[PDB]
RNA sequence: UUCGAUACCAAGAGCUGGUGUCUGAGGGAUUACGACUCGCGUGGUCGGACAGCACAUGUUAGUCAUGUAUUAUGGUGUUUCCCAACACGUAUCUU
RNA sequence: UUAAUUCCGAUAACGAACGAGACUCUGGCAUGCUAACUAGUUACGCGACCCCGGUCGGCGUAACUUCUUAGAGGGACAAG
């Protein structure tokens, strides 16, 4: 019953709508929900030179890429939450349903 | 997956995956009006969508090139059979797609149309399609050995700030001619549609509007329209 | 007796200190140790300043634990001197006459405002072409 | 005869917007201000200060607009600009229940005679009914005010379950509470209204706006009784609880009237002039009599509550 | 260095020109009416316009403000 | 020193709030149906109203449409899933 | 006058567009809100040591979100 749905996404409002959708689906299917626990955002940071040559003033580019991680833990037999999580998928987020 | 790599390495892996896929499909579908890619990795599906203008040329004669492209996709990137499914579709109002318009100009120059006539023909189509403001600048050697830069511009075009990231669509391409290379930069400012189909749904941050006060008339004597 | 506890925090920099006020006798302790064994000893009176302003009579009824983390030595001492001062004021606003709270708050905020209000200053980020925030590398001509 | 000052209640940072009195306690008044705190006072009427603040009720995010005390004398209800209500036990001043549902600022809120019905008029164009157990009971959205819902008020006459609501759209609407359906529209006011009250009789209603015209209204028929000339903007309106008087806060002064013969009983304006050097006088925004009607308490917009006692 | 730009002044002058009936001398009242009447996409610019409205209308009361 | 209001209790009520039966007035999804595309399998797009229906089947109107089974351009019954009375409905049970 | 062709003033100019600004990220604030066994706290039961208390990043499970985390709004505008 104790099953772990984690959502890893680069875009935030996408992830938030998926987090909302799984709470909606859970409270409708009448099963105990642990709310969307927000793990710290990881900021992948790469900083390079701008110029292809080396005949300019030393200006650097600061490239960032945030990656967000939510998880909701439910008390439900595999099936009903599997069919809840088989609907309403968008390209931004990525799903993991963990049983044990 | 027992290889069990970091979410950090997983997302940069997915980043380079789309980047090369796009490079390969822009190199392949170059002449046949190619707009871009999209991936939807569903549970055990890699639904890999392509956006083009001339989709009949790219999906070919009874799906020869589609199964050819699906084969090289599964063969190179190392995918399972049945799981990978390509879907070529037509992009709406091509007039606003900077990729499609830049490659259209490039292939009118490859045909051998006049340079001012090529640019004004493109820029006129961009504007009648409903671009709030357009910008076409083709650079390189014309009529001689010294390099020139022709700029063709009309309407309202923003350069600085954040709104550039969701109002201005830009694309840069190279055209091979017999004397050297010319560069093509197409730069289109999209109009505002609240639906978010044709352009964005955020109005410009400085642009402020007022709804007109409804023309009322003040009463003089107290009234009541009592009911039950 | 029932609960008469208020957990109240004091920050001066990265450092933070959560004072746990409670009913009882007069004891003040930081990570187990008492006040007068928290080094550096140079800033001894910085921890005592709330005590020596208000006397030990106002702390007769309260026994304030403090747990501290982050920052360095001087930041941590300024975090905890702020925390216990807010913790007593928050206790006297919940369980005692507000006339008492008002009198204590006026006594402190006149001596030093840094007791109740946090210092909003944070170490500024470095920019390239320089060894710090604003400093730039030595430019050479000829 | 005339009213006169004994002293002032100095215990606010942001300026006082509402005052609330209960019939049970004489030495307990509740002032809501434009900080986030409701100050529950202890009136002594000593030579030094008329009252000292004994409790401050914290929990609100934005300005507490409204406050009202229950029949029992234990519960108070306040409404703030955050768009939620708070239900306080005056004992310790910790919140019992918070009411959630509205989107924009909740501008006022009123109890029943029973304390079993609560009503909130808000800046979002709605009135909403509230139980005392945190439940969104009924919205009224379609047949409502075309501008903000400035105020709503319940009546002491318990025989006719009616509510009076003054808006910004130059109306006074009246709803059959059991139906929560429109009974009478009241057109007549030129411009928006601040305040509406019901005379302790449950007989005749007042209405005040920027126009400076205090128009009386009938709860029995749908008929305009008569009008008074405020002169300045009316921000506050309430009747004397025992006497047949109406008191209005005409911006920087109080104008109190006898209702049978329309003449000024007296006008109350600060005579200790501090704003005499190119400064506009700070203006009264709420007033309410005691349970007895001996003392009128008036809250100003320079963080002060003044006392007005009958010299006769 | 607090000089308001054309977008603040123009839009504030237009709101004073039309809706003089509701606007006042209090900042937070006319901030809310300005948010209601006018579609301003950012919150900083909303506070800037409301702030100018309740400075011009504090001088309309004084005398012959020009613009 | 008379007369009518005011704290009190009781005699049931009424009110009010809580509980919760039942129905779907409605509100959803895609799985009906449609359309537009084809690699002929689908992929999009309507998403319950916009499809269909069989003379089956409720209500009937212009009596004149018609060339009087008839069909008007009745225009609403039938029914495939789901959440649902802030639709303050109100069964019971309290206050 | 402003950081600014930033504005209000004079004014045959009026109304506008690019750049400035606005914008995005960021820093500081919430004892208000949604949440937490990959974060804690407070109380508790137990265990160890000093003379009822004291210490514990020693052990363990009912409340709660002050401290940590990251979402939604709020807040500041030369406004008094």
């Amino acid at each position: 019953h104790r099953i772990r749905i984690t959502l890893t996404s680069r875009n935030v409002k996408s992830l938030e709508k998926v987090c909302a959708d799984l709470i909606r689906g859970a409270k409708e299917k009448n099963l105990k929900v642990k709310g969307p626990v927000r793990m710290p955002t990881k900021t992948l940071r790469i900083t390079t030179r701008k110029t292809p040559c080396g005949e300019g003033s030393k200006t650097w580019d600061r490239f960032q890429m945030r990656i967000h991680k939510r998880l909701i833990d439910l008390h439900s037999p595999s099936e009903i939450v599997k069919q809840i999580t088989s609907i309403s998928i968008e390209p931004g987020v990525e799903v993991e349903v963990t049983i044990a | 997956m027992a290889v069990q790599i970091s979410k950090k390495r997983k997302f940069v892996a997915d980043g380079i995956f789309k980047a090369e896929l796009n490079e390969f499909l822009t190199r392949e579908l170059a002449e046949d009006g190619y707009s871009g890619v999209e991936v939807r990795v569903t549970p055990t599906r890699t639904e890999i969508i392509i956006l083009a203008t001339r989709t009949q040329n790219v999906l070919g004669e009874k799906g020869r090139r589609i199964r050819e492209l699906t084969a090289v996709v599964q063969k190179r990137f190392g995918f399972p059979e049945g799981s990978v499914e390509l879907y070529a579709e037509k992009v709406a109002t091509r007039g606003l797609c900077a990729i499609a318009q830049a490659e259209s100009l490039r292939y009118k120059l490859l045909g051998g149309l006049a340079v001012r006539r090529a640019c004004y023909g493109v820029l006129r189509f961009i504007m009648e399609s409903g671009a709030k403001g357009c910008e076409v600048v083709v650079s390189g050697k014309l009529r001689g050995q010294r390099a020139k830069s022709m700029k063709f511009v009309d309407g309202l075009m923003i350069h600085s700030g954040d709104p550039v990231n969701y109002y201005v669509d830009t694309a840069v391409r190279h055209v091979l001619l017999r004397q050297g290379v010319l560069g093509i930069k197409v730069k289109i400012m999209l109009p505002w549609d609240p639906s978010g189909k044709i352009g964005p749904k955020k109005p410009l941050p400085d642009h402020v509007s007022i709804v007109e006060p409804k023309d009322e008339i003040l009463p003089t004597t107290p009234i009541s329209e009592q009911k039950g | 007796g029932p609960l008469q506890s208020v957990q109240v925090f004091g920050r001066k920099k990265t450092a933070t200190a959560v004072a746990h006020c409670k009913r009882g006798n007069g004891l003040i302790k930081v990570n187990g140790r008492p006040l007068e064994m928290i080094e550096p000893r140079t800033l001894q009176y910085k921890l005592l300043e709330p005590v020596l302003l208000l006397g030990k009579e106002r702390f007769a009824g309260v026994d304030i634990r403090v747990r501290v983390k982050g920052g360095g030595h001087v930041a941590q001492i300024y975090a905890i001197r702020q925390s216990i001062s807010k913790a007593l004021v928050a206790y006297y606003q919940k369980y005692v006459d507000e006339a008492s709270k008002k009198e204590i708050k006026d006594i402190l905020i006149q001596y030093d405002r840094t007791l109740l209000v946090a210092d909003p200053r944070r170490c500024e980020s470095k920019k390239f072409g320089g060894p710090g925030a604003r400093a730039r590398y030595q430019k050479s001509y000829r | 005869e005339q009213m006169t000052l004994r002293g002032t209640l100095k215990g606010h940072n942001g300026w006082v917007t509402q005052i609330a009195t209960t019939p049970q306690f004489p030495d307990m008044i509740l002032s809501a201000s434009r900080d986030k705190t409701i100050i529950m006072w202890k009136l002594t009427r000593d030579e030094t200060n008329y009252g000292i603040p004994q409790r401050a009720l914290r929990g609100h995010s934005h300005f507490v607009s409204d406050v009202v005390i229950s029949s029992d004398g234990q519960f108070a209800l306040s409404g703030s600009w955050d768009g939620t209500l708070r239900l306080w036990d005056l004992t310790t001043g910790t919140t019992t229940r918070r009411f959630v549902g509205h989107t924009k600022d909740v501008l006022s809120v009123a109890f029943s005679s029973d304390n079993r019905q609560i009503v909130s008029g808000s800046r979002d164009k709605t009135i909403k009914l509230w139980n005392t157990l945190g439940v969104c009971k009924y919205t009224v959205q379609d047949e409502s005010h075309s501008e903000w819902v400035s105020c709503v008020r319940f009546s002491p006459n318990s025989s006719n379950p009616i509510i009076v609501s003054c808006g910004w759209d130059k109306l006074v609407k009246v709803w059959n509470l059991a139906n929560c359906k429109l009974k009478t529209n009241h057109i007549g006011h030129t411009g928006y209204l601040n305040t509406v009250t019901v005379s302790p009789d449950g007989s005749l209603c007042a209405s005040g706006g920027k126009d400076g015209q205090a128009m009386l209204w009938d709860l029995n028929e749908g008929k305009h009784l008569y009008t008074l000339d405020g002169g300045d903007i009316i921000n506050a309106l309430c009747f004397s609880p025992n006497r047949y008087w109406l008191c209005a806060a005409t911006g920087p002064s109080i104008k109190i009237w006898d209702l049978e013969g329309k003449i000024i009983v007296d006008e109350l304006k600060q005579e200790v002039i501090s704003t005499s050097s190119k400064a506009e006088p700070p203006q009264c925004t709420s007033l309410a009599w005691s349970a007895d009607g001996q003392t009128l308490f008036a809250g100003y917009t320079d963080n002060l509550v003044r006392v007005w006692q009958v010299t006769i | 260095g607090r000089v308001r730009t054309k977008t603040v002044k123009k839009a504030a002058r237009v709101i004073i020109e039309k809706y003089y009936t509701r606007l006042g001398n209090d900042f937070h009242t006319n901030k809310r009416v300005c948010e209601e009447i006018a579609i301003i996409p950012s919150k900083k610019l909303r506070n800037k316009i409301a702030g100018y409205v309740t400075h011009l209308m504090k001088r309309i009361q004084r005398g012959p403000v020009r613009g």
Side-chain angles (χ1 to χ4, degrees):
Chain A
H1 291 231
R2 276 73 182 188
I3 293 178
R4 190 198 213 83
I5 319 163
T6 190
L7 309 167
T8 306
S9 84
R10 209 194 291 161
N11 204 310
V12 186
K13 53 176 279 187
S14 295
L15 188 70
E16 284 296 336
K17 195 178 191 175
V18 178
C19 290
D21 279 1
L22 292 206
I23 280 182
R24 292 197 95 80
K27 295 318 303 168
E28 289 303 334
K29 275 283 172 68
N30 309 319
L31 65 97
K32 293 175 279 167
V33 57
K34 299 295 186 179
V37 175
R38 288 131 172 164
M39 298 283 97
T41 63
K42 331 178 187 193
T43 66
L44 312 199
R45 204 171 297 150
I46 295 186
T47 75
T48 88
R49 282 285 289 275
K50 262 175 180 171
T51 181
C53 68
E55 308 298 351
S57 318
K58 284 69 184 156
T59 65
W60 299 72
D61 268 317
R62 288 171 263 193
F63 291 100
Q64 308 205 34
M65 175 173 129
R66 279 170 174 76
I67 176 61
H68 312 257
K69 176 171 303 194
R70 313 311 170 80
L71 54 95
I72 281 180
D73 288 35
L74 302 183
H75 301 146
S76 180
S78 184
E79 189 266 317
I80 59 166
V81 294
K82 276 197 75 65
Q83 308 314 314
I84 291 158
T85 55
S86 183
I87 198 66
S88 304
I89 303 96
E90 73 189 315
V93 309
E94 192 60 31
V95 176
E96 285 183 0
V97 170
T98 310
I99 308 160
Chain B
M1 200 184 290
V3 75
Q4 187 206 345
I5 73 162
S6 310
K7 311 311 287 210
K8 304 194 200 163
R9 295 194 83 167
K10 173 171 176 281
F11 268 77
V12 186
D14 181 52
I16 293 173
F17 169 59
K18 277 180 175 66
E20 196 197 7
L21 162 62
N22 186 27
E23 172 76 354
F24 179 60
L25 265 52
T26 326
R27 281 188 183 281
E28 176 52 39
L29 304 176
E31 57 260 36
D32 298 318
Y34 166 69
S35 182
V37 281
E38 181 165 4
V39 177
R40 276 198 199 77
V41 59
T42 99
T44 319
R45 304 291 94 191
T46 299
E47 187 173 4
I48 166 166
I49 278 178
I50 306 181
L51 300 90
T53 73
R54 309 219 283 268
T55 55
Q56 301 304 309
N57 284 65
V58 309
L59 108 152
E61 180 177 27
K62 206 212 298 186
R64 193 213 176 80
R65 262 157 213 152
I66 331 167
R67 283 182 292 257
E68 282 179 357
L69 261 61
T70 315
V72 289
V73 162
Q74 194 185 322
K75 203 174 200 298
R76 183 255 181 267
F77 294 98
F79 280 130
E81 187 158 295
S83 298
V84 187
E85 44 188 20
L86 275 71
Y87 290 119
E89 280 161 13
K90 264 189 282 191
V91 71
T93 173
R94 163 197 67 265
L96 294 157
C97 297
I99 298 109
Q101 296 302 319
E103 291 182 349
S104 293
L105 170 50
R106 178 174 140 211
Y107 262 67
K108 287 175 182 188
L109 281 153
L110 216 66
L113 186 57
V115 194
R116 291 232 172 84
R117 300 295 289 265
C119 290
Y120 268 115
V122 165
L123 185 138
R124 181 50 178 150
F125 176 50
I126 290 161
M127 281 301 306
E128 68 192 11
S129 71
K132 187 76 161 177
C134 176
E135 175 90 68
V136 174
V137 45
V138 299
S139 185
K141 46 166 60 173
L142 276 94
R143 90 185 69 267
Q145 297 301 106
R146 185 63 83 113
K148 210 65 62 60
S149 58
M150 291 179 169
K151 196 152 90 186
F152 310 90
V153 57
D154 73 332
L156 155 60
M157 173 60 71
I158 75 181
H159 299 122
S160 74
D162 174 47
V164 172
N165 285 10
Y166 56 75
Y167 262 91
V168 166
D169 191 356
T170 187
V172 187
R173 305 292 174 234
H174 309 261
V175 64
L176 281 74
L177 279 84
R178 55 162 165 76
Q179 200 70 57
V181 196
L182 271 73
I184 308 162
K185 298 182 167 177
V186 180
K187 199 180 188 178
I188 309 166
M189 199 184 163
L190 301 184
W192 185 52
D193 69 314
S195 68
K197 282 200 192 173
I198 312 171
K201 298 195 293 176
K202 296 179 189 171
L204 275 171
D206 57 335
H207 172 79
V208 50
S209 60
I210 309 96
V211 302
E212 194 71 33
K214 185 266 164 189
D215 278 30
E216 75 264 56
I217 287 291
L218 62 93
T220 52
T221 190
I223 327 166
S224 182
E225 289 296 330
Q226 186 172 16
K227 60 184 282 184
Chain C
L3 277 300
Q4 286 203 325
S5 281
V6 287
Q7 286 202 85
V8 162
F9 73 96
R11 281 192 274 260
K12 188 256 153 180
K13 223 175 274 192
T14 286
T16 183
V18 189
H20 176 46
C21 182
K22 186 193 316 195
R23 85 162 304 126
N25 63 339
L27 74 92
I28 304 182
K29 282 180 167 282
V30 173
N31 303 13
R33 284 160 272 261
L35 277 199
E36 298 188 350
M37 306 297 162
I38 298 295
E39 289 212 343
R41 282 203 186 284
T42 321
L43 315 183
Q44 178 54 232
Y45 288 100
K46 285 301 177 190
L47 296 207
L48 308 186
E49 260 164 5
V51 164
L52 289 166
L53 285 160
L54 309 186
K56 72 168 174 70
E57 179 54 37
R58 265 65 158 281
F59 288 83
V62 300
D63 38 6
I64 301 185
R65 269 85 177 176
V66 183
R67 81 189 167 274
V68 198
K69 288 183 67 75
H73 292 98
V74 181
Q76 272 186 348
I77 281 176
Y78 278 42
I80 63 189
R81 77 187 285 268
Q82 164 168 325
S83 73
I84 70 173
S85 184
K86 288 170 61 175
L88 180 68
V89 160
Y91 180 65
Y92 276 49
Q93 94 178 1
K94 191 146 113 166
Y95 295 97
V96 196
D97 194 336
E98 269 70 339
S100 305
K101 187 265 281 176
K102 178 162 172 176
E103 179 162 322
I104 299 170
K105 191 180 276 279
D106 291 329
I107 283 164
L108 300 159
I109 201 169
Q110 281 186 343
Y111 177 67
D112 175 33
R113 186 181 145 88
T114 325
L115 268 302
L116 294 161
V117 195
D119 207 353
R121 302 193 282 180
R122 294 295 199 270
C123 185
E124 183 178 317
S125 54
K126 194 181 85 71
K127 294 89 195 180
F128 58 77
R134 302 204 184 284
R136 300 299 173 205
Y137 292 123
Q138 196 189 335
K139 197 193 288 280
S140 172
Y141 316 111
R142 293 112 174 89
Chain D
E1 55 173 316
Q2 65 187 238
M3 319 293 112
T4 318
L5 243 72
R6 203 184 283 245
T8 322
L9 264 55
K10 181 75 178 178
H12 278 302
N13 260 313
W15 30 272
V16 50
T17 59
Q18 188 73 73
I19 309 191
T21 48
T22 194
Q24 297 290 115
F25 302 102
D27 299 4
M28 196 280 290
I29 198 158
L30 202 63
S31 189
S33 55
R34 203 193 267 261
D35 57 28
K36 282 73 71 181
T37 62
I38 315 160
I39 296 290
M40 185 196 149
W41 310 69
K42 167 196 145 180
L43 292 183
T44 73
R45 314 185 186 76
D46 288 321
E47 66 95 358
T48 56
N49 50 300
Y50 203 86
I52 211 74
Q54 192 140 48
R55 193 53 48 124
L57 285 78
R58 297 179 166 282
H60 273 292
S61 184
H62 210 207
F63 308 139
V64 172
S65 63
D66 195 7
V67 67
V68 58
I69 311 168
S70 307
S71 190
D72 181 31
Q74 295 302 325
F75 274 169
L77 196 77
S78 83
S80 166
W81 290 35
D82 67 339
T84 66
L85 296 169
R86 290 283 171 177
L87 185 54
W88 316 77
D89 45 39
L90 263 58
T91 56
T92 71
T94 193
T95 311
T96 302
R97 201 69 56 181
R98 71 183 199 282
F99 303 96
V100 186
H102 286 236
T103 43
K104 277 214 194 67
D105 309 10
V106 173
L107 265 170
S108 85
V109 58
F111 276 113
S112 59
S113 301
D114 323 350
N115 313 143
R116 304 212 157 194
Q117 283 291 89
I118 284 157
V119 60
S120 277
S122 55
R123 249 160 191 141
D124 74 299
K125 300 177 170 61
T126 49
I127 288 169
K128 277 188 56 45
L129 278 295
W130 300 100
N131 306 311
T132 43
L133 296 195
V135 183
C136 161
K137 187 37 58 196
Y138 201 64
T139 59
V140 288
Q141 53 270 34
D142 191 288
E143 312 91 338
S144 314
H145 300 249
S146 63
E147 213 60 42
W148 305 340
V149 191
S150 189
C151 179
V152 300
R153 277 299 174 285
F154 275 25
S155 181
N157 277 346
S158 189
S159 60
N160 54 334
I162 210 70
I163 179 180
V164 67
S165 62
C166 72
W168 285 73
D169 61 341
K170 320 176 295 159
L171 280 181
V172 171
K173 278 198 168 74
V174 150
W175 309 68
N176 302 125
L177 273 164
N179 308 331
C180 205
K181 292 299 299 178
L182 180 56
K183 156 179 173 282
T184 177
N185 273 1
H186 286 311
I187 308 175
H189 275 282
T190 176
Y192 75 95
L193 297 196
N194 283 120
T195 319
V196 61
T197 181
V198 184
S199 183
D201 305 329
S203 291
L204 76 163
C205 158
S207 283
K210 178 176 277 187
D211 53 348
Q213 290 291 342
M215 304 183 188
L216 271 299
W217 295 96
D218 201 61
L219 281 78
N220 305 128
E221 313 97 51
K223 301 302 162 290
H224 172 256
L225 295 186
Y226 58 93
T227 315
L228 294 84
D229 50 344
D232 211 336
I233 180 157
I234 286 94
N235 300 315
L237 261 172
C238 181
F239 295 80
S240 181
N242 58 344
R243 289 176 197 85
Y244 206 72
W245 284 353
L246 180 60
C247 64
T250 62
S253 61
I254 309 296
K255 283 190 181 66
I256 63 177
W257 273 287
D258 194 61
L259 281 298
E260 195 282 322
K262 271 55 72 178
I263 193 165
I264 319 103
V265 163
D266 201 42
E267 187 189 339
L268 315 172
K269 182 258 189 176
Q270 60 282 1
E271 284 193 332
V272 73
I273 317 310
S274 57
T275 64
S276 57
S277 297
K278 190 62 191 72
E280 188 174 13
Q283 57 199 3
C284 176
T285 173
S286 272
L287 89 177
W289 299 91
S290 297
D292 59 16
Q294 180 64 43
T295 302
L296 173 60
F297 288 113
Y300 277 59
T301 62
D302 65 329
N303 318 335
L304 285 178
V305 160
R306 276 171 192 74
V307 318
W308 301 101
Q309 302 185 331
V310 183
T311 52
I312 296 296
Chain E
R2 287 166 180 276
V3 190
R4 303 170 193 80
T5 71
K6 61 207 302 187
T7 54
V8 164
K9 292 205 187 295
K10 280 182 174 173
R13 282 197 182 99
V14 165
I15 279 165
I16 291 166
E17 186 269 314
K18 287 182 172 185
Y19 301 77
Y20 190 82
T21 67
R22 321 187 203 176
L23 300 167
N25 214 307
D26 169 281
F27 179 92
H28 307 261
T29 45
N30 88 297
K31 172 181 71 185
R32 292 287 193 238
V33 86
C34 177
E35 193 276 320
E36 181 58 32
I37 67 177
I39 299 301
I40 318 162
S42 60
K43 173 168 59 170
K44 194 187 285 284
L45 205 63
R46 182 190 74 191
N47 297 340
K48 294 280 280 291
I49 291 160
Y52 197 62
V53 165
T54 46
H55 161 61
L56 275 192
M57 276 188 57
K58 210 173 73 69
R59 204 156 59 78
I60 283 179
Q61 311 322 301
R62 200 208 159 201
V65 54
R66 289 180 35 79

